[PDB]
Amino acid sequence: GPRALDLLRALPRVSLANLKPNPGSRKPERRPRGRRRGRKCGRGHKGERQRGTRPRLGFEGGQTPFYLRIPKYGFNEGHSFRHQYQPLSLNRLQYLIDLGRVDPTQPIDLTQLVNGRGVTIQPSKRDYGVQLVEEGADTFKAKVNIEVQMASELAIAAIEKNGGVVTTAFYDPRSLEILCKPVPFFLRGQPIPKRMLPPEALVPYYTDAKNRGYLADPARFPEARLELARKYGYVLPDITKDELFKMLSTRKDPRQIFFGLAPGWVVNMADKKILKPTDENLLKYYSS
Template sequence: MLKNGKLASCVIRQIFSVKLIPTCRYISIEKNDKKNDKKNDKKIDINDQNNKSNINLNDLKIGKHFREMFHDGEERNFESHPFNRRFAYSKKSLFPIEPRNLRTLGLNRQRKKKRGRGDKCPGKGIRDKHKHRKSGKPNSRTFESGRTPLYRRLPKWPEAWLSRQKKQYEFLNLSKLRYFIEKGRLDTRFPITQRHLYDSKCVRVKNGVKLFNINDYPFPYKINIEVANADQSSIDTIKKVGGSITIIYMERVNLRAHIKPYKFEILPKTARPNLDAIHFLEKMRSRGCIVKYIKPLWLIEEEKRIINELTEIEECSKLSNNEYSFENKDSGKEDEQERRERLLQKYRLQNTKMSEDN
């Protein structure tokens, strides 16, 4: 007890740099004599013992929080800062009673015990069982009291299924295209592809873009646009100002690779169209569009056969009319592509006339 008081007084002197602090404590010792009822108080002065005992500086190093070596090399007592939470003393208890320390409600509540109720109707009646059955609702409109319903008796209509298999194009109005050009989202100096339309958020491309025009809306910009389909009004409007519409055949995978090429390590090959797609593309060519697709082998062979037949017919007609000349044979080689296109167009016109007559 005395030793602790002695050390505390030394620490207080060093902290507050006071030479002498009155720390007089008196201990009274009472001696009771049964014979003589006299009380003798013996008082012991502690100050005298403190002054006599010379305390070394090493005795002051009683803890890390009191004696520290600072950055300048000086060794002195550590004074706690009031804003340092580590050495701030609070009057709160070790575990204060606060809302954050209380347990949440409902932890100690007694939960309802789950009881088994059998396999028929678990204590809720037969009506509740029929209400939640999997086979169907008791009051459904198609229910015919156990008989085969009408929608199952009738045969399926194949045209309904076939209509759902057709490509549903994403429609793009010519007025919306003009709005995006005027806002600067599309550049008319370069060809506008379906990827440009998708990146500019002009239209969502899933199966292809179909361009259409309503009431011959004026379109003053000369553009070269590539789409999957277009109507006659938009074709005439764009060609009137000197532009062009290109119809490109793209399958689902090719179209996805065209719009998002970063998702493919190796770009897929362009697919060849089937017979129905070729009929559609050639119909768009006759309307005035530029058509691009890879011709299948059977179409290439068929065109060769048609061209050979038509050239033979023309030569025979020239020989019969004495119009055939052996001069300028090289001129025919130069215009071979034009002759080929002319003969194919002639063949198409013949077929269209025959179909109209029938």
């Protein structure tokens, strides 16, 4: 390929003896010696600056500092405690399906999004999960089963028009940590934890059919969903008559962190075996 090889035929052996760093890769380091850099050494003359003791950063020389005049105001207020939702465009989603990172074949949740490196979640930073925004709304062709943390109307509308099913789920911080990195969790050697219920402010969000929250009454799903089809003017596909209907139907227990696993089990990766307790108190604790 690289005609450089043919040049390498005629040249002497590469060794340690001849090695040249890229031109301008190293910038020469300057030292205060000689006529130019010596004699005040770029430090200026007397004053406070040549003794090196001049004041700290904000200091204005004694008039009231710029950063200390301005009144304070809630800006960064409670910034520790505001939930954060990593956005996911339908562009990005269509993209991940198209190049076949995520497969629409099996049900698509947060874990499989992480595994596709489509979205990076850091529970530790007060990040509560993925949200759905409508950027690829027109472009979007895929038939998908998605579970996000927060969704927008136009997003749900798009996924309907293509005949998929969206569902909103809430995870607490701990559950989210476990959900986003399942393997480093199993190597802890802890049981599989209970999933928390949403706190009080979020609860009104997850009981609505309009939202299609996981804690909502399924009975309203055939209603509100049809409503969405009127507004954006598409005909609603029949999910029951579909061939993949058994996958779309699949939900999680509100107390389950994982698909088909159960709260309280323990995964042993060495013997490739799952452990479940028979203890009455234990089983009551996890089953609740």
